[PDB]
């Protein structure tokens, strides 16, 4: 399960998630799983999808995860009123904008990468598309 | 799936064997197991006969280059060719016994001298002996 090993600060402002992604090309592998939607990927979602694609390719080829859950998410438990400090960090998310290549793969045929990426996509909260490496 | 490169090559291989052979036999082979066929392929190679199943469209193309351009009207239904490249005869006799013993099929028409032989008059190339008989 992905998580920053250490951070400058424990907690983070909610912020917003406007714009289009940086890192929209297949940069390391032959194929990629790209975000078509906007949202938050949790470390558990990223791990579930990584497991699905890895089982599918029978741990053959190579896999790259282009996303990193570096944003801490706090939560207030039940029977706790408003205020009295910012809540405790429970989990980590990556902010996703339309166009991010989430995962990459090579060393496997296209048909197998499409199937492995189909299985991984079913674990994710945002709509995705299958992408291939291009000449420029 | 057969490509045009494949189709042209099959016409070429059967057009070459058409020129060299002396007596050619055209017949039906629908409803006959591979056990009896591999038995007629062993009986064919032995008698110097070339055995093939070719698409009737591909045959009308290999036969257009003369002298079997009369066998056209026998390229309707499953077609099996018997090209005798070594000694005229062999096939026309081999097929008649295979037809009678197995009861299936009928044997379409035979060809020799660049002339058409009907289904009833195939007794002409069935009574012919050896080369090798004049001595």
């Amino acid at each position: 399960m992905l998580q920053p090993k250490r951070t400058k600060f424990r907690k983070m402002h909610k912020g917003r998630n406007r714009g289009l992604a940086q890192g929209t090309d297949v940069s390391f592998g032959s194929f990629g799983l790209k975000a078509v939607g906007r949202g938050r990927l949790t470390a558990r979602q990223i791990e579930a999808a990584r497991r699905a694609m890895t089982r599918a390719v029978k741990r053959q080829g190579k896999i790259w995860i282009r996303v990193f859950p570096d944003k801490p998410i706090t939560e207030k438990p039940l029977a706790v009123r408003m205020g009295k400090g910012k809540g405790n960090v429970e989990y980590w998310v990556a902010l996703i904008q339309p166009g991010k290549v989430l995962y990459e793969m090579d060393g496997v045929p296209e048909e197998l990468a499409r199937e492995a990426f189909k299985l991984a996509a079913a674990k994710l909260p945002i709509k995705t598309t299958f992408v291939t490496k291009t000449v420029m | 799936a057969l490509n045009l490169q494949d189709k042209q090559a099959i016409v070429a291989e059967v057009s070459e064997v058409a020129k060299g052979a002396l007596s050619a036999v055209v017949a039906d082979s629908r409803g006959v197991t591979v056990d009896k066929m591999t038995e007629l392929r062993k009986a064919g190679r032995e008698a110097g006969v070339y055995m093939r199943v070719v698409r009737n469209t591909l045959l009308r193309r290999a036969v257009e280059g003369t002298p079997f351009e009369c066998l056209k009207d026998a390229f309707v239904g499953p077609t099996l060719i018997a090209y005798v490249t070594e000694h005229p005869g062999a096939a026309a006799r081999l097929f008649k016994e295979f037809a009678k013993a197995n009861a299936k099929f009928e044997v379409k028409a035979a060809a020799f001298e660049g002339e058409l032989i009907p289904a009833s008059q195939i007794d002409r190339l069935a009574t012919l002996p050896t080369y090798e008989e004049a001595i």
């Binding site: 289009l20 929209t24 166009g99 598309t129 000449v135 420029m136 | -």
Partner: protein
């Protein structure tokens, strides 16, 4: 030999370029040499199918701008963030 039909752009900027893409067209630029850069508009479907061949990015292409023929090479490409569409192309005079 790849032959691309283009028209010179009568406009420039954000508004004009988005209007082109809404009309199944896309802007592109031709630069290099002593000549002034030439801002052009391309048919999206025609150039999209062409660039699917790896030869588009290696070969010398010919852009036909009002009868005139311009020998070029694909320099850079701005692709749509997630759709199989082209946003803009840079051509360098060959």
């Amino acid at each position: 030999m790849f032959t691309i039909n283009a028209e010179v752009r009568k406009e420039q900027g954000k508004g004009a370029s988005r209007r082109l893409r809404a009309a199944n067209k896309f802007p592109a630029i031709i630069y290099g040499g002593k000549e002034a850069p030439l801002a052009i508009e391309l048919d999206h479907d025609k150039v999209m199918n062409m660039q699917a061949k790896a030869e588009f990015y290696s070969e010398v292409l010919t852009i036909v701008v009002d009868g005139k023929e311009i020998k070029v090479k694909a320099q850079d490409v701005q692709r749509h963030p997630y759709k199989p569409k082209l946003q803009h192309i840079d051509f360098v005079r060959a």
